[PDB]
Design a protein around this ligand. Structure first.
Ligand code: NDP
Ligand code: OED
Length: 180
């Protein structure tokens, strides 16, 4: 059993990116992102993160590859990465096949790029979406894919509002109905 979960923070318009970077800076939100994508049930197993090239380029090089996770970067243009914690994959199919061959990978966390999310939303491994809903319009130029939330069951745990730097947000968790 290999789950692919999507994790994203979207604003009120569904925007995720602006000028190649994040439209906001939310340290507590990103700390939770780090915990969700890193922590495993089986110790000595690892999670993988799959991302597009522009997500990769948006991470400060001092934090690349993302620590304690196996990084897969989708790109047709990037040269191969010598670091053993990151592999450049030339297609979504080859990335997922490489990850399911690795027995020490517990969960695949799809951390986007719009096209990477879209492919995740069509993957047989699709399990959950962890969506941070940020209040307001941050004038994004890249957006989360159009998704049919009717495909999913929204979890009903209590979810409070959060605020940092005057920016408000709420967490949501969705499970594909065929799982459930
Ligand atoms: N708010 C959030 O939660 C998130 C925000 N963002 C923001 O979004 C943006 O992102 P986006 O602009 O969508 O770009 P991506 O991160 O999706 O990178 C796009 C590139 O990834 C490569 N790629 C994507 N899909 C494939 C594929 N199927 N096969 C091969 N290569 C592929 C190509 O790279 P090449 O051109 O080299 O082939 C493509 O140009 C930034 O601003 C980032 O900060 C990103 C993720 C989440
Ligand atoms: C190597 O160890 C480190 C050290 C320091 C940091 C913090 C920092 O670099 O500032 C990190 N973390 C990141 O680098 C990071 C990675 C991806 C993104 C975008 C992203 C995708 N998907 C999302 N989903 C939600 N919910 N929120 C998001 O913010 C995103 C945002 C931040 C890792």
């Amino acid at each position: 059993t290999l789950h692919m979960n999507l994790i994203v923070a979207v604003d009120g318009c569904g925007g995720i990116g602006r000028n190649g970077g994040m439209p906001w800076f939310l340290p507590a939100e990103m700390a939770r992102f780090a915990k969700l994508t890193t922590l495993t049930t089986d110790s000595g197993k690892k999670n993988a993160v799959i991302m597009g090239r522009k997500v990769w380029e948006s991470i400060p090089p001092k934090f690349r590859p993302l620590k304690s996770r196996f990084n897969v970067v989708l790109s047709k243009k990037m040269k191969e990465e010598s670091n053993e914690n990151v592999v450049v994959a030339r297609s979504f199919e080859s990335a997922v096949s490489l990850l399911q061959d690795m027995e020490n990978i517990e969960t695949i966390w799809n951390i986007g790029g719009r096209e990477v999310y879209e492919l995740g939303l069509n993957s047989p491994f699709l399990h959950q979406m962890y969506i941070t809903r940020v209040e307001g319009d941050f004038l994004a130029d890249v957006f989360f894919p159009r998704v049919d939330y009717g495909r999913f069951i929204k979890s009903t745990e209590s979810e409070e509002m959060h605020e940092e730097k005057g920016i408000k947000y709420r967490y949501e968790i969705y499970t594909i109905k065929t799982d459930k």
